[model samples]
Target: STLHAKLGGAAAVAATVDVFYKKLMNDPDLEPFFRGVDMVTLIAKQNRFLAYAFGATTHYHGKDIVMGHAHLIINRGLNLTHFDKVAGHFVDSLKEMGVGQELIDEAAGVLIGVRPLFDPERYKGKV
Candidate 1:
């Protein structure tokens, strides 16, 4: 079965994002980044991104990584620290849902693959 099917499909992904965002929005370091944004829609977009990353679909209609995050990196000075915090929350969220370690590792691989979006210079050869 696909990772999507293994994780309870789209519904599970959506639920995970919801809980994931809750953790993010409550995090003092991350909360300010989301201020003044439309969280509901943002959450939906994140749901789409994760679904695609975890093998639900090949089509991910969310923002191009750099384009989507340039605002955050340029305006708010986003860096690896922020990305790591967010990633930690993602892993924690999956654990909370009782997702298997193998699946979580795969999910981490997907996030790591896109690490350059947060820091192109540092993550270039690293990834």
Candidate 2:
């Protein structure tokens, strides 16, 4: 089954996004990027992103990953470590919601593949 199906459809995805963003926004390392973000719109788009990313659905109308983070990189200097922190939040959020380790690993694999394509230079180092 798809990770989307395994995680229980749109309802579960919504729950995941709620918890995911709450953790991400609360994390000092990630809070900056989330500050002043439009929670309603952002959360809706994120829900769409997850639906597409997890193979649940393909109705995503949000900005592409690179474009989505373009401002953060162009302005605030987001780097590889910041990306890692967000991915870590992904893992932690999934675990917190009772997702299995294997599924989490699968999700990480997808993120690893998608991230490098966002901006090769943005992932130069921890700093």
Candidate 3:
């Protein structure tokens, strides 16, 4: 089936999101964006996004990526660097969970496709 199923479904996705956010929060560069943020809700949204991204679901009800991250991009200087670092953590989390390279690569591909959506340059004067 889908990568979500291959990765063991919701439970597995939740575990990865937990690890991923912990890594993100621990990073000095990424930590600021989460300050005072509602992590419980953020984590839940992340789980849903990952589930949808991995093909576990057909729809994502959360805010669009660019819209969801607008404040960070406009006020906190979120850019490709932050996005890439997050992507790195994602792959690392999957590896930590003993996921195979092929699957990790597939997941990376999915992240890569969405990279532009997070590019601050695109929103320089638009937002």
Candidate 4:
């Protein structure tokens, strides 16, 4: 039931992605990584990502889950600290939009779920 956030849920999530992306883009550490990123597409991808996380739909076509971050994590040096901060911002974005803690936690879980693979000891240059 926590996943259901009324009819505006999709729009709410879209807005939160905006906030999160703004924070991400302005982040001096991350902005370089997102250079020339297409905000419009990123917005849609994040919306689909949220929807897919809440099991609202099955048509998300964003990036490859496992392979998508391979190069970034290896070649670009995307680390766990970056993941933590960006994901914290993600939760904060949802909370800022009035989404409750349970849902926020769930979303945070969804975002950070894949990060363990990048843990210092775990990263073995597979990408």
State the lDDT of candidate 3 residue by residue for 3-106, as single tens digits: 55777775786788888888988999888878888968878866765665565656543347667788788877888999899889888988998888888887
State every prediction's TM-score relative to the real structure: 0.81, 0.77, 0.83, 0.74
For model 2, how does the per-residue alpha-carbon lDDT over 3-92 read when each residue is reduced to its tens digit? Answer: 557887757877898888887778988788777778787787667655555656554323476667676776778777888887788778
| Candidate maximizing TM-score | 3
- How close to the true structure is residue 126 of candidate 3, measured as C-alpha lDDT? 36
- Candidate 3 stretches with Cα past 4 Å from truth are 2-4, 9-11, 61-63, 125-127
Native-structure RMSD, model 4: 3.5
RMSD in order of candidates = 4.5, 4.0, 2.8, 3.5
**Deviation in angstroms for 49 in model 3?**
3.8
In terms of TM-score, how similar is model 2 to the real structure?
0.77
Better of 2 and 4 by lDDT: 2
In candidate 2, which residue pairs clash?
Answer: none
- lDDT (CA) for every model shown? 0.77, 0.72, 0.77, 0.66
Task: Kindly indicate the candidate among 1 and 2 with the higher lDDT.
Answer: 1
lDDT of 1 by residue, 32-54 (tens): 98888896777876676666657
Q: Roughly what TM-score does model 1 have, to 2 decimal places?
A: 0.81
